[PDB]
Design a binder for these strands. Sequence first.
DNA 1: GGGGGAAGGACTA
DNA 2: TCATTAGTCCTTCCCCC
Length: 341
Amino acid sequence: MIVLFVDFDYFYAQVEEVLNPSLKGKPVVVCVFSGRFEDSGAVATANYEARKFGVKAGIPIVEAKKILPNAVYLPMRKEVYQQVSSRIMNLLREYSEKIEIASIDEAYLDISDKVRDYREAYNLGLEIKNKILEKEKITVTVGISKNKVFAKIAADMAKPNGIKVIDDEEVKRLIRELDIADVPGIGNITAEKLKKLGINKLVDTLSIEFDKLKGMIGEAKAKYLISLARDEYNEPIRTRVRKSIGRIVTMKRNSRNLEEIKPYLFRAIEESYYKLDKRIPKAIHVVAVTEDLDIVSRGRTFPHGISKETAYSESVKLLQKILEEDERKIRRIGVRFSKFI
DNA sequence: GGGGGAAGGACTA
DNA sequence: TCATTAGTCCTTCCCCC
Ligand SMILES: Nc1ncnc2c1ncn2[C@H]1CC[C@@H](COP(=O)(O)OP(=O)(O)O)O1
Ligand SMILES: [Ca+2]
Ligand SMILES: [Mg+2]
C-alpha cells in the first residue's frame, strides 16, 4: 500500500491570512475566548511566526500575550474554517476514491491503485499541493509512506509547506531511531510509562515480555506498538462517519446551582441540534468539566430518536445525576449526542 | 469466558 | 484570573448469556 496524508499548515491561522493578506509575515494567534474575564481562554492555533516564540495551541491567551503582546489575536471562526476545509477536501476526492477525512485539516488517501512507486507518489503529492495552492491559496504538508502511521510521521517531519516520503528502508531506520513519544497515539502519560520500562524506540517493544508491556499501557496500545515495530501495522483507509456531535461551553463562574447551570446547558443543546442537521441521535450525554478540571458525564440511550424537547428534559435529569453524585463545582457544561439512526 | 453498556481515561487536532 | 473546543478509541466495572 502507498498512503498519502495531507495535513493543512497552521490551518485556522492560515485561513485568516488568506482572508486578510496584510497578516502574512506577522505572528497571528487564533483564540478560543471563554468569556470569564478579559482574555480568558486558550490558543487554538498560531502561525509559525508566533510558534517560533513559544506561542502555540493550548496555552492560555494571557500567557501568549505576555510573550507576544503585539501579535495579532483573533477569535476562532470555526464555520469559516470548516467551509474552507470542505472545499479543500473536495479537491482531494479527485486523486482517490479511497479517502479518510481524519479531522478538519487532515486526510489520508490510499493511492496504491493510482501510482506505481514512491517516485510517482511524490509527484502526485506535488500535484496535490499545487492544486490546493492554485484553488485556495492554502499550503499543506504531504507525508507519504507504506501505512497511515508513517505517512503521518512523514508530515510531522516535513511541515510546514513540505513533502516527504518515508520509504521501506527509512521505516526500518525509524523503528530503531525514532523517539517513541513521537509515535501517533503516545501522549505524555504513555510516554512516561514507556520511559520507565526502558522503551525509547519502537524496536524496544520487541524485547520486553508482552505481559509486562500490556500491564503498563494496556493490550491495545501494546499490540499497536508491537505491530509497528515488526513492520506489520495494517489499518485500511476508511470513509469516516461521525459518531457523535456535541457542544460544551464555559460558564461565567463555577457553580453547582441547577438553575444557574441550565441556560448554558440549554444553549449547548440548541447549538448541538443545529449541528446535527437531520441526524437523529438515540443517545444523549451531559458532560461537565469540574472546577479542578476533571471530566464527569452521565448519559442515556433511548430505543428511539431524541426530539429536541426530550433532549431538554433528559439533560436536566442527567445534570442532576452529576450534581447528586459529585460534590464539586462545575466550570464547563455541555452535551454530546450519539447513536444516530 | 466474553458480549455489550456506562463512565472514566488518553489522546488527537 | 491560567487551564478552549471537539471527537475517537480504549479500559474498567458490571449485568448477563
Ligand atoms: N489545543 C487545541 N485546541 C483547539 N484546537 C486545536 C488544538 N490543537 C490543534 N487544534 C486544531 C486547530 C487547527 C486545527 C489544525 O491545527 P494546526 O494545523 O494548527 O496543527 P499542526 O501545525 O500541528 O498541523 O487543529
Ligand atoms: Ca495541520
Ligand atoms: Mg507524543
